[PDB]
Design an enzyme around this catalytic site. Sequence first.
Site, PDB file in Angstrom:
ATOM      1  N   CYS A 109       0.825  -1.223   0.000  1.00 48.78           N
ATOM      2  CA  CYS A 109       0.000   0.000   0.000  1.00 48.78           C
ATOM      3  C   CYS A 109       0.854   1.266   0.000  1.00 48.78           C
ATOM      4  O   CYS A 109       1.555   1.537   0.961  1.00 48.78           O
ATOM      5  CB  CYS A 109      -0.959   0.022   1.210  1.00 48.78           C
ATOM      6  SG  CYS A 109      -2.042   1.491   1.159  1.00 48.78           S
ATOM      7  N   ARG A 112      -0.134   4.627   2.741  1.00 44.79           N
ATOM      8  CA  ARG A 112      -0.011   4.485   4.208  1.00 44.79           C
ATOM      9  C   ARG A 112       0.285   5.729   5.030  1.00 44.79           C
ATOM     10  O   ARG A 112       0.234   5.665   6.251  1.00 44.79           O
ATOM     11  CB  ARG A 112       0.902   3.320   4.597  1.00 44.79           C
ATOM     12  CG  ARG A 112       0.340   1.957   4.188  1.00 44.79           C
ATOM     13  CD  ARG A 112       1.361   0.888   4.562  1.00 44.79           C
ATOM     14  NE  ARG A 112       2.394   0.700   3.529  1.00 44.79           N
ATOM     15  CZ  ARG A 112       3.518   0.011   3.716  1.00 44.79           C
ATOM     16  NH1 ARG A 112       3.782  -0.541   4.910  1.00 44.79           N
ATOM     17  NH2 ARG A 112       4.358  -0.159   2.693  1.00 44.79           N
ATOM     18  N   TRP A 281      -9.270   5.993  -1.188  1.00 42.73           N
ATOM     19  CA  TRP A 281      -9.593   6.681  -2.437  1.00 42.73           C
ATOM     20  C   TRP A 281      -8.546   6.207  -3.452  1.00 42.73           C
ATOM     21  O   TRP A 281      -7.524   5.668  -3.064  1.00 42.73           O
ATOM     22  CB  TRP A 281      -9.605   8.230  -2.266  1.00 42.73           C
ATOM     23  CG  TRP A 281      -8.376   8.818  -1.609  1.00 42.73           C
ATOM     24  CD1 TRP A 281      -7.157   9.061  -2.202  1.00 42.73           C
ATOM     25  CD2 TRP A 281      -8.245   9.246  -0.243  1.00 42.73           C
ATOM     26  NE1 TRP A 281      -6.275   9.611  -1.277  1.00 42.73           N
ATOM     27  CE2 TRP A 281      -6.917   9.725  -0.070  1.00 42.73           C
ATOM     28  CE3 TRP A 281      -9.120   9.275   0.857  1.00 42.73           C
ATOM     29  CZ2 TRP A 281      -6.445  10.227   1.162  1.00 42.73           C
ATOM     30  CZ3 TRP A 281      -8.649   9.780   2.093  1.00 42.73           C
ATOM     31  CH2 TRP A 281      -7.327  10.254   2.224  1.00 42.73           C
ATOM     32  N   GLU A 286      -4.289   3.499 -11.055  1.00 39.30           N
ATOM     33  CA  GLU A 286      -5.042   2.265 -10.870  1.00 39.30           C
ATOM     34  C   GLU A 286      -6.115   2.207 -11.940  1.00 39.30           C
ATOM     35  O   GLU A 286      -6.326   1.157 -12.532  1.00 39.30           O
ATOM     36  CB  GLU A 286      -5.710   2.219  -9.469  1.00 39.30           C
ATOM     37  CG  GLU A 286      -4.691   2.122  -8.332  1.00 39.30           C
ATOM     38  CD  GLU A 286      -5.372   2.187  -6.963  1.00 39.30           C
ATOM     39  OE1 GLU A 286      -5.882   1.130  -6.537  1.00 39.30           O
ATOM     40  OE2 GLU A 286      -5.397   3.278  -6.337  1.00 39.30           O
TER      41      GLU A 286
HETATM   42  C1  HEM Z   1      -6.526   6.399   1.518  1.00 42.48           C
HETATM   43  C2  HEM Z   1      -6.100   6.238   0.265  1.00 42.48           C
HETATM   44  C3  HEM Z   1      -5.365   5.028  -0.210  1.00 42.48           C
HETATM   45  C4  HEM Z   1      -4.593   4.959  -1.352  1.00 42.48           C
HETATM   46  C5  HEM Z   1      -4.321   6.109  -2.298  1.00 42.48           C
HETATM   47  C6  HEM Z   1      -4.087   3.630  -1.459  1.00 42.48           C
HETATM   48  C7  HEM Z   1      -3.229   3.187  -2.476  1.00 42.48           C
HETATM   49  C8  HEM Z   1      -3.021   1.838  -2.730  1.00 42.48           C
HETATM   50  C9  HEM Z   1      -2.619   1.308  -3.992  1.00 42.48           C
HETATM   51  C10 HEM Z   1      -2.369   2.141  -5.231  1.00 42.48           C
HETATM   52  C11 HEM Z   1      -2.492  -0.042  -3.860  1.00 42.48           C
HETATM   53  C12 HEM Z   1      -2.118  -1.043  -4.952  1.00 42.48           C
HETATM   54  C13 HEM Z   1      -3.474  -1.459  -5.516  1.00 42.48           C
HETATM   55  C14 HEM Z   1      -3.465  -2.311  -6.763  1.00 42.48           C
HETATM   56  O1  HEM Z   1      -2.603  -2.156  -7.646  1.00 42.48           O
HETATM   57  O2  HEM Z   1      -4.365  -3.183  -6.915  1.00 42.48           O
HETATM   58  C15 HEM Z   1      -2.865  -0.348  -2.517  1.00 42.48           C
HETATM   59  C16 HEM Z   1      -2.855  -1.623  -2.015  1.00 42.48           C
HETATM   60  C17 HEM Z   1      -3.351  -1.880  -0.745  1.00 42.48           C
HETATM   61  N1  HEM Z   1      -3.793  -0.977   0.186  1.00 42.48           N
HETATM   62 FE1  HEM Z   1      -4.075   0.890  -0.071  1.00 42.48          FE
HETATM   63  N2  HEM Z   1      -4.455   2.926  -0.383  1.00 42.48           N
HETATM   64  C18 HEM Z   1      -5.311   3.663   0.376  1.00 42.48           C
HETATM   65  C19 HEM Z   1      -6.014   3.276   1.555  1.00 42.48           C
HETATM   66  C20 HEM Z   1      -5.994   1.980   2.096  1.00 42.48           C
HETATM   67  C21 HEM Z   1      -6.765   1.549   3.218  1.00 42.48           C
HETATM   68  C22 HEM Z   1      -7.803   2.355   3.956  1.00 42.48           C
HETATM   69  C23 HEM Z   1      -6.403   0.232   3.473  1.00 42.48           C
HETATM   70  C24 HEM Z   1      -6.940  -0.671   4.522  1.00 42.48           C
HETATM   71  C25 HEM Z   1      -7.378  -0.177   5.693  1.00 42.48           C
HETATM   72  C26 HEM Z   1      -5.414  -0.116   2.494  1.00 42.48           C
HETATM   73  C27 HEM Z   1      -4.773  -1.327   2.428  1.00 42.48           C
HETATM   74  C28 HEM Z   1      -4.190  -1.750   1.237  1.00 42.48           C
HETATM   75  C29 HEM Z   1      -3.875  -3.178   1.045  1.00 42.48           C
HETATM   76  C30 HEM Z   1      -4.109  -4.343   2.034  1.00 42.48           C
HETATM   77  C31 HEM Z   1      -3.351  -3.254  -0.203  1.00 42.48           C
HETATM   78  C32 HEM Z   1      -2.848  -4.528  -0.870  1.00 42.48           C
HETATM   79  C33 HEM Z   1      -3.919  -5.198  -1.746  1.00 42.48           C
HETATM   80  C34 HEM Z   1      -3.371  -6.489  -2.359  1.00 42.48           C
HETATM   81  O3  HEM Z   1      -2.326  -7.066  -1.921  1.00 42.48           O
HETATM   82  O4  HEM Z   1      -3.987  -7.011  -3.310  1.00 42.48           O
HETATM   83  N3  HEM Z   1      -5.155   0.972   1.723  1.00 42.48           N
HETATM   84  N4  HEM Z   1      -3.111   0.821  -1.818  1.00 42.48           N
HETATM   85  C1  1Q7 Z   2      -8.065   0.501  -0.187  1.00 42.40           C
HETATM   86  C2  1Q7 Z   2      -7.541   0.663  -1.597  1.00 42.40           C
HETATM   87  C3  1Q7 Z   2      -7.296   1.942  -2.097  1.00 42.40           C
HETATM   88  C4  1Q7 Z   2      -6.862   2.074  -3.424  1.00 42.40           C
HETATM   89  N1  1Q7 Z   2      -6.591   3.283  -3.969  1.00 42.40           N
HETATM   90  N2  1Q7 Z   2      -6.680   0.987  -4.194  1.00 42.40           N
HETATM   91  C5  1Q7 Z   2      -6.919  -0.267  -3.755  1.00 42.40           C
HETATM   92  C6  1Q7 Z   2      -6.661  -1.390  -4.747  1.00 42.40           C
HETATM   93  O1  1Q7 Z   2      -7.612  -2.433  -4.720  1.00 42.40           O
HETATM   94  C7  1Q7 Z   2      -7.336  -3.496  -5.648  1.00 42.40           C
HETATM   95  C8  1Q7 Z   2      -6.514  -4.628  -5.024  1.00 42.40           C
HETATM   96  C9  1Q7 Z   2      -7.099  -5.166  -3.721  1.00 42.40           C
HETATM   97  N3  1Q7 Z   2      -6.624  -6.508  -3.386  1.00 42.40           N
HETATM   98  O2  1Q7 Z   2      -6.468  -5.700  -5.937  1.00 42.40           O
HETATM   99  C10 1Q7 Z   2      -5.127  -6.181  -6.065  1.00 42.40           C
HETATM  100  C11 1Q7 Z   2      -5.203  -7.516  -6.745  1.00 42.40           C
HETATM  101  C12 1Q7 Z   2      -4.938  -8.696  -6.037  1.00 42.40           C
HETATM  102  C13 1Q7 Z   2      -5.031  -9.919  -6.702  1.00 42.40           C
HETATM  103  C14 1Q7 Z   2      -4.756 -11.210  -5.980  1.00 42.40           C
HETATM  104  C15 1Q7 Z   2      -5.389  -9.930  -8.051  1.00 42.40           C
HETATM  105  C16 1Q7 Z   2      -5.648  -8.718  -8.709  1.00 42.40           C
HETATM  106  N4  1Q7 Z   2      -5.999  -8.714 -10.017  1.00 42.40           N
HETATM  107  N5  1Q7 Z   2      -5.546  -7.536  -8.052  1.00 42.40           N
HETATM  108  C17 1Q7 Z   2      -7.368  -0.453  -2.434  1.00 42.40           C
END
Ligand code: HEM
Ligand code: 1Q7
EC number: 1.14.13.39
Lengths: 405, 405
Positions: A109, A112, A281, A286
């Site tokens: 993420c 953070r 958000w 993305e």
């Molecule tokens: C507040 C604005 C936030 C932004 C801009 C943001 C940004 C991102 C981005 C760009 C990713 C990669 C997503 C992807 O390529 O699919 C990500 C992954 C993630 N974020 Fe965030 N995030 C935010 C809030 C949060 C919140 C609130 C949580 C949980 C409480 C969170 C937990 C995660 C987790 C667990 C992943 C990993 C998902 C995965 O492994 O598939 N994030 N974040």
């Molecule tokens: C909370 C949050 C904020 C933000 N800006 N973006 C996100 C991204 O959400 C998509 C993430 C959530 N697992 O998907 C990642 C993913 C995981 C897997 C196993 C496959 C796939 N295609 N994509 C999550």
Amino acid sequence: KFPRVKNWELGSITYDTLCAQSQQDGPCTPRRCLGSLVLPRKLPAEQLLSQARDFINQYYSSIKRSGSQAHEERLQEVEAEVASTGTYHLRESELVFGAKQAWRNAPRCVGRIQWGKLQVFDARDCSSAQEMFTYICNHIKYATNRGNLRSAITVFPQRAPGRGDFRIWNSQLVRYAGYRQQDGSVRGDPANVEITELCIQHGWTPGNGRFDVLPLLLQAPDEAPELFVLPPELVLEVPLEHPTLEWFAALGLRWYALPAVSNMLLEIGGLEFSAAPFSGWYMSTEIGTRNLCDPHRYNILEDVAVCMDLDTRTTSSLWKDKAAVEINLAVLHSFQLAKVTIVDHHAATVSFMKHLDNEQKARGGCPADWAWIVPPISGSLTPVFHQEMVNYILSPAFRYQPDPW
Amino acid sequence: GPKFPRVKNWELGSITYDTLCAQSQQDGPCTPRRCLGSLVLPRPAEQLLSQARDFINQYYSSIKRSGSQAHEERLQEVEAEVASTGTYHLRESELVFGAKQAWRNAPRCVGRIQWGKLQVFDARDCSSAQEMFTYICNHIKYATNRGNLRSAITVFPQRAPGRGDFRIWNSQLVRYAGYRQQDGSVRGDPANVEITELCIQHGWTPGNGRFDVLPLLLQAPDEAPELFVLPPELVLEVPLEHPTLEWFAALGLRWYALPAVSNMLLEIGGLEFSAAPFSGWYMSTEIGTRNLCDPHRYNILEDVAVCMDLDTRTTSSLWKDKAAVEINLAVLHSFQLAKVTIVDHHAATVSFMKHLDNEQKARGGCPADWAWIVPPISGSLTPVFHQEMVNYILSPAFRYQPDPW
Ligand code: HEM
Ligand SMILES: Cc1cc(N)nc(COC[C@@H](CN)OCc2cc(C)cc(N)n2)c1
Ligand code: HEM
Ligand SMILES: Cc1cc(N)nc(COC[C@@H](CN)OCc2cc(C)cc(N)n2)c1
Ligand SMILES: C[C@H](O)[C@H](O)[C@H]1CNc2nc(N)[nH]c(=O)c2N1
Ligand SMILES: C[C@H](O)[C@H](O)[C@H]1CNc2nc(N)[nH]c(=O)c2N1
Ligand SMILES: [Zn+2]
């Protein structure tokens, strides 16, 4: 040995000592690095008790009450409960602390910097798919906030040894249908073909558009999942247009405001929360880069390039790169015009660098997955490209879990 | 499934298992507890013989004579030679095979589709710094080939017991000077401040432009390095212009044709070739994104955005992305006009995917460093972004070595 961590743009060096707190193995060994894998290959009371204790100590240390009578009593409560029942329950304040910490600890993420600002809805008194739906609606309403997005998590009842899990079958709360065509192609989002089919099969009357919002499949323990249509007024969407290319709006493109992950497991002190959807958000790439330009997603690069009158016959015209930039620009412009929170990849990675620095001071490190933190366009134009990062698993953690079907 | 790393391509949905990583004899920097994949540089007796034997086995397999009488006699020859002298020597064809395999093994190189096509110049007879210069000039002439570039390596005598090393002090055969200024800034390439000041300490009269070609500092065993100026007509450069932005030519930017790495150690069967410079042709992002746009390199992004009249006061205009694209386009266009071989990052990554498929069938895998293979702009627009990769060290190998000073 503690890893030396170098920033190559600034020449500065840190040492990660936080990685020493890791109690769970990642996929790598000295023989071979598996850091680029998306999923783990591999996806008793004393072990629960030691995770529980470690987490209770984390909590009391966070409120600066470490070693207090409140602290010792709480550990005895946890111990007495595990020993009699094989499990325990968190206090709401512990749950709130645990959920912020799982987000803080999430290596993939980039958002953070915000980790301390998280609305936690305690939904552990949920007993039916119907109640889950009501909680989900309230979450969406709260998190959306008329375009002024606020980070939120809703936590449904934990897994229990004697029974099925509470699950949301959808991977996100808001997802567009993907309809497989008799001629192999997909209308809509190819990533959602399987969940779209599950929905239809469980009674949903499907649409036939490119951007049909899916219903939710919500499952209470050991019951078939139930279908729930989200009220369209709940799901804020942004029509995509370009600040200068007028034909762009003619493409009919749009995306939803709220990114809300709903298929991940939340682990706090050895307890596991199989349904705990969370949302923040978007970062513009993305949507602009992955969701719209991935070849296995909406795949619109060619369309946009043709529209921009670019030479599509050769890679060396960099038509792909040029079209992607404009698509990302369109997303940023449209979200700004609609007054919906979004952050671009430059501002996001600059905030993440400040986060790395805060965390170095506060904890002596920060787990980060370089391949995921670096954005999918303009990598080296952002400061995180030049930053070495150590990846490791801390708990509380968000984890992947098997699909429930 | 199989007990080998499972590797997924997320674009195509396809799976492979890497069985080649089994052949790794050398640990990387990762452990179960923490992944150090993003780190740029992580920190003989019977030992030699077992490396030698393993290499000789690789050679005889590659010509399909494993277990043959010629294979067993070579083994015996090598242990006898080590037995009495502590070291051994490679046959010419063994050197050629080992150099190609070193390249084939290089996890950070995206150009490995070409690995079989490498001209190996055997310079193991070299006995002075003057002769090293002659060989290096010949290499540059052959490799440059008036713009039709050809991959080449020149191999100087191996490390020997007691005796000093052959070393090229410069990190590449062609580098631009970087001159530290009174104001604290750098004219030229800041990557090269140290080698520049070393060249001056050794008697080079410095220039004062942004693109001054450095002389070579060449060190023959147990001697101080000697300074050699490359004849300007041997160093092909390409002035940079843009296909439609007429002012871009007025910036007076340029880059040299030949990327020729000169400070790496080539290791074959335990033997160490401390001077073994190798060259290919550029991928356009190396020049247009990294050398010209890194903040710590020429850092031209802002100057270009200003000429393009972009809004450089806000991240969300995507001024950096727009400027970087045009600079990359100018690089491609100018090399093309000048008839100098170059490959764009789309063609290059497509050929690397082909390489992965060839190697899957030939050897059951391919060591690859994802962070290095994915290009620094337009990452997920290239097929390698969606490809999981297993990184591990095989030998023969190119390795980093400490600076000779
Ligand atoms: C507040 C604005 C936030 C932004 C801009 C943001 C940004 C991102 C981005 C760009 C990713 C990669 C997503 C992807 O390529 O699919 C990500 C992954 C993630 N974020 Fe965030 N995030 C935010 C809030 C949060 C919140 C609130 C949580 C949980 C409480 C969170 C937990 C995660 C987790 C667990 C992943 C990993 C998902 C995965 O492994 O598939 N994030 N974040
Ligand atoms: C909370 C949050 C904020 C933000 N800006 N973006 C996100 C991204 O959400 C998509 C993430 C959530 N697992 O998907 C990642 C993913 C995981 C897997 C196993 C496959 C796939 N295609 N994509 C999550
Ligand atoms: C034929 C054209 C070639 C292309 C397009 C090419 C492409 C590249 C690129 C883009 C990199 C990363 C550069 C960086 O970011 O610093 C690289 C690294 C490398 N390539 Fe090549 N390559 C080519 C030929 C060669 C040859 C001929 C050899 C050696 C025989 C070689 C061995 C290497 C090695 C060892 C590295 C890693 C260097 C390091 O870790 O610092 N490549 N290649
Ligand atoms: C043979 C070859 C072909 C090609 N297209 N590109 C290359 C580029 O190699 C540059 C490599 C050299 N180890 O860059 C890594 C590096 C080395 C040094 C000393 C500094 C630095 N910033 N980065 C080499
Ligand atoms: C194979 C590779 O690890 C995979 O494509 C990853 C790379 N980096 C990513 N980074 C983010 N933020 N999201 C992703 O889905 C991916 N995919
Ligand atoms: C911190 C990070 O490892 C570093 O900036 C790497 C990332 N990927 C790279 N990839 C290539 N090809 N060349 C590089 O110099 C780098 N730099
Ligand atoms: Zn690793």
